[PDB]
Amino acid sequence: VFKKVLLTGTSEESFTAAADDAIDRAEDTLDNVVWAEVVDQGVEIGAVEERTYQTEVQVAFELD
Amino acid sequence: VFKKVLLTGTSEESFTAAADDAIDRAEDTLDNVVWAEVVDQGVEIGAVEERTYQTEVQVAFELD
Amino acid sequence: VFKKVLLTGTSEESFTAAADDAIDRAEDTLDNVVWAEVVDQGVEIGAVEERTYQTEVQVAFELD
Amino acid sequence: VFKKVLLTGTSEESFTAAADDAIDRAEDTLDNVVWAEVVDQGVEIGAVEERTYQTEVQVAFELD
Amino acid sequence: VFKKVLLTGTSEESFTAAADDAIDRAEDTLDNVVWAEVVDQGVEIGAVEERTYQTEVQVAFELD
Amino acid sequence: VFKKVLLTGTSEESFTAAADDAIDRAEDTLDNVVWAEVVDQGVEIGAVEERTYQTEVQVAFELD
Amino acid sequence: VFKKVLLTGTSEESFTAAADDAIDRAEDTLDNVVWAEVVDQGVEIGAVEERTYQTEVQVAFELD
Amino acid sequence: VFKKVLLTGTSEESFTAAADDAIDRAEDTLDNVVWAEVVDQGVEIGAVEERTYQTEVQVAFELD
Amino acid sequence: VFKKVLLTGTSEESFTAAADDAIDRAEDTLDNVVWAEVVDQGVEIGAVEERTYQTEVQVAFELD
Amino acid sequence: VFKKVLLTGTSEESFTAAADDAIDRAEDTLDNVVWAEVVDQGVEIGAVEERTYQTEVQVAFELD
Amino acid sequence: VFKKVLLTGTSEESFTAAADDAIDRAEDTLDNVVWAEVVDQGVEIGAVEERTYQTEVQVAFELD
Amino acid sequence: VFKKVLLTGTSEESFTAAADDAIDRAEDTLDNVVWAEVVDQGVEIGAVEERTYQTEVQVAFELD
Ligand SMILES: Cc1cc2nc3c(=O)[nH]c(=O)nc-3n(C)c2cc1C
Ligand SMILES: Cc1cc2nc3c(=O)[nH]c(=O)nc-3n(C)c2cc1C
Ligand SMILES: Cc1cc2nc3c(=O)[nH]c(=O)nc-3n(C)c2cc1C
Ligand SMILES: Cc1cc2nc3c(=O)[nH]c(=O)nc-3n(C)c2cc1C
Numbered sequence A, B, C, D, E, F, G, H, I, J, K, L: 001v002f003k004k005v006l007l008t009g010t011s012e013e014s015f016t017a018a019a020d021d022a023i024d025r026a027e028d029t030l031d032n033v034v035w036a037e038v039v040d041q042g043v044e045i046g047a048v049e050e051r052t053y054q055t056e057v058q059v060a061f062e063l064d
């Protein structure tokens, strides 16, 4: 059985690096992370000093 | 990093109050709740005494 | 077996009340109405004296 | 010919009132506003003192 | 309030049995599982000895 | 001209048998049923003794 | 309250004429037909002597 | 950079002519119109003397 | 077994004729073409002398 | 690099067996078939002696 | 109230830089730009000397 | 007439480079490649030594 968690990563550099930021967090706390699916991308402008790229991913991990 | 949980709130009064019911539950158990996105709305009729409005939300919270 | 009918309710008050208007009509004419799913919401402006909120629902009822 | 503008209204009270807030703004600046279609709903939590309901609408107006 | 978890079940037999595999896992660890919605179906071929059917479900459970 | 009706079939056995349950009902009451399109699948758990598979179909029939 | 019926019109000439074929049928049998929304378009080739254009519409009519 | 405006053209003749009606209006007021994407089609019936076909397009134009 | 190919037809006349242009090409090179599904429509303006209507279709053909 | 082909399998027995029918055909003619994604399901009724289940899949294969 | 404009940025380097190109243009002409949502990505090949990455964004700005 | 092929490119570096990997393969084997549309993005983790970014594109080419 796989389970997915819905995470938004952030980066001041790129959409790829924002995806990595989410996956990094998943790997910090979960075993057997197997893949990620991109489900949204965006850019935060008004709330930050530098533009911040965001990539939202479903991160899949194998249970048991 | 943000994470989202997928919650359906209920209310005998309105779709807005059903959204609040979900967000209230998230705030009971999670720190740093930052926003919610409505993803579905519905009305339960046959299983209840009074019509019950339901609003399903992805509730986003900031990790760490 | 359930069947659904696709109804747009209207209200001069709210999206919740517009959903109720559709469900009310379904219950006038159908037995065993069990739930409704919201599929669209809108506001009529140019054709009416007062803004009219509209909520379109699939209203499900149990056959037999 | 109709044209649409994509507006997000806000309210501390309800999704219906947030839709009205957008339509009000459109009517301040545009002639012949004829209808609105709801395209998204959400709730701002972390950036505000009170929860703020948001309703995004395509507001249609007749040209010429 | 209901909450959903996003699970992919697997089976060497059928899409129905793959859905059951996910629901079984949810019932092992959660109380008050109430329904599941199918959100994707697929077949793993290259990574397995026998074709493996997969059915991804949002499994809903009642909180509290 | 074709017309479609939106039916949810049920089965304690499989998603295929749930689709058949809907189509069977359509054929009981309608002439010239020509095809069905699957539009949703789900599993009822909390309201039933045995898990019940549900398959929602648009059932198309030829008018006249 | 509005209700919609889901009809596929056909024409050997065009997608516009296929939409008209559906609307014509609705007006034969229903009072107060008010609008139609196109939801799919296609072309039947193998089952017919001449290519047949098909346009599927939700035809809305006002109840009461 | 391209920008798009969301226009609904109308015609008493066809969906193609309704698309042209929108594009014509864009070309009246904008320089460097480069393409259009159809996003919806419909037919107005109750508000008009003759059926009126409508085609909604995102009309893209090059800035600068 | 059916297979589909994803073709964009073009016409200086209409969306229907653009669909035909794609289907014509499929029939030039494939046996047993059975139907087509419209998946997108658009208009090329900047790259052409005359507006060019485009209709993208999945063209289905029976294998073997 | 992976490539996908869009195939509709058929079966007089089940949606799972219809998916297998498509994958079987892909494996007859292609090397390195790695997975399939279900994209539609349906039932043919009017054109056949027995109901025929159909499952449409994108079948992915590795190039080179 | 927020308003969105629908812009396609371009870059010979990356999808991230194409998003920035759109946002840059918005900030040239608009006050209070607050965020952007990615809605499409593509690559122009035939019309250009070098491949050109394109990222289409809804750029949101606060009115008043 | 344009035709599209559905390709998933891969890269250990970025989503942009994964798109290029697919387009490169198309240009190896096809004449008159004209554009690509991004349709999905993902990251392979469990099956590889280094995270592998994947970008799925419809690559369009002009026939004849
Ligand atoms: C992708 C994205 C979407 C957003 N949407 C909203 C919104 O709907 N309302 C809001 O007050 N702020 C937003 N913000 C700040 C956003 C920010 C980003 C990066
Ligand atoms: C929005 C909504 C959707 C529902 N869908 C189903 C369903 O598919 N099958 C079912 O047995 N009960 C339902 N029920 C009870 C529902 C109830 C609600 C409120
Ligand atoms: C949600 C909504 C959508 C509508 N769409 C259209 C349309 O496409 N064309 C039209 O002539 N009138 C409309 N009207 C009047 C509308 C009215 C509402 C309330
Ligand atoms: C509906 C909604 C969506 C939002 N999405 C985002 C987002 O993607 N990223 C972000 O930094 N802030 C958001 N914010 C603050 C949002 C706020 C709202 C109300």
Ligand SMILES: Cc1cc2nc3c(=O)[nH]c(=O)nc-3n(C)c2cc1C
Binding pocket: E041, E042, E043, E044, E054, J034, J035, J036, J037, L008, L042, L044, L054
């Ligand atoms: C439904 C399904 C989808 C898949 N998608 C991918 C993919 O995008 N990339 C990949 O390397 N492997 C996959 N695999 C292995 C898949 C496997 C299945 C069963």
Ligand SMILES: Cc1cc2nc3c(=O)[nH]c(=O)nc-3n(C)c2cc1C
Binding pocket: B008, B042, B044, B054, E034, E035, E036, E037, F041, F042, F043, F044, F054
């Ligand atoms: C597919 C499916 C969806 C459902 N959705 C809901 C829902 O939204 N709310 C609810 O009270 N019950 C449901 N129920 C009971 C459901 C049941 C099924 C089988």
Ligand SMILES: Cc1cc2nc3c(=O)[nH]c(=O)nc-3n(C)c2cc1C
Binding pocket: G041, G042, G043, G044, G054, I034, I035, I036, I037, J008, J042, J044, J054
């Ligand atoms: C738009 C369209 C879609 C169709 N889809 C199918 C299908 O999925 N299976 C089938 O046996 N026949 C079809 N047929 C015959 C079709 C025919 C048309 C016109």
Ligand SMILES: Cc1cc2nc3c(=O)[nH]c(=O)nc-3n(C)c2cc1C
Binding pocket: C008, C042, C044, C054, G034, G035, G036, G037, H041, H042, H043, H044, H054
């Ligand atoms: C495509 C289309 C959609 C429409 N939708 C609505 C609606 O939702 N409510 C309404 O009062 N009128 C409409 N009208 C009048 C419409 C008219 C058209 C042509």
Ligand SMILES: Cc1cc2nc3c(=O)[nH]c(=O)nc-3n(C)c2cc1C
Binding pocket: H034, H035, H036, H037, I041, I042, I043, I044, I054, K008, K042, K044, K054
């Ligand atoms: C439907 C359609 C869509 C198009 N999209 C784009 C695009 O995204 N970028 C571009 O440079 N050119 C386009 N072009 C030229 C287009 C042309 C048409 C006809």
Ligand SMILES: Cc1cc2nc3c(=O)[nH]c(=O)nc-3n(C)c2cc1C
Binding pocket: F034, F035, F036, F037, G008, G042, G044, G054, J041, J042, J043, J044, J054
């Ligand atoms: C899933 C499915 C869809 C279909 N759609 C159509 C259609 O749109 N028009 C038609 O003449 N026949 C169809 N047919 C025969 C179909 C058959 C199937 C099995």
Ligand SMILES: Cc1cc2nc3c(=O)[nH]c(=O)nc-3n(C)c2cc1C
Binding pocket: I008, I042, I044, I054, K041, K042, K043, K044, K054, L034, L035, L036, L037
């Ligand atoms: C994303 C994208 C989509 C496009 N779509 C089309 C199209 O549909 N027709 C066309 O003539 N050119 C296009 N072009 C040139 C395109 C170009 C791009 C970059």
Ligand SMILES: Cc1cc2nc3c(=O)[nH]c(=O)nc-3n(C)c2cc1C
Binding pocket: A034, A035, A036, A037, E008, E042, E044, E054, L041, L042, L043, L044, L054
């Ligand atoms: C985007 C993506 C999606 C995937 N989906 C699946 C899946 O559904 N099942 C599976 O066994 N493996 C997958 N895999 C390995 C995937 C891999 C990727 C990169």
Ligand SMILES: [Cl-]
Binding pocket: A006, B006, E006
């Ligand atoms: Cl989710």
Ligand SMILES: [Cl-]
Binding pocket: C006, F006, G006
């Ligand atoms: Cl429907």
Ligand SMILES: [Cl-]
Binding pocket: D006, H006, K006
């Ligand atoms: Cl828009």
Ligand SMILES: [Cl-]
Binding pocket: I006, J006, L006
């Ligand atoms: Cl495809």
Ligand SMILES: [Mg+2]
Binding pocket: A012, A013
């Ligand atoms: Mg930096």
Ligand SMILES: [Mg+2]
Binding pocket: A040, A042, A056
């Ligand atoms: Mg988002």
Ligand SMILES: [Mg+2]
Binding pocket: B012, B013
């Ligand atoms: Mg009360």
Ligand SMILES: [Mg+2]
Binding pocket: B040, B042, B056
């Ligand atoms: Mg729901």
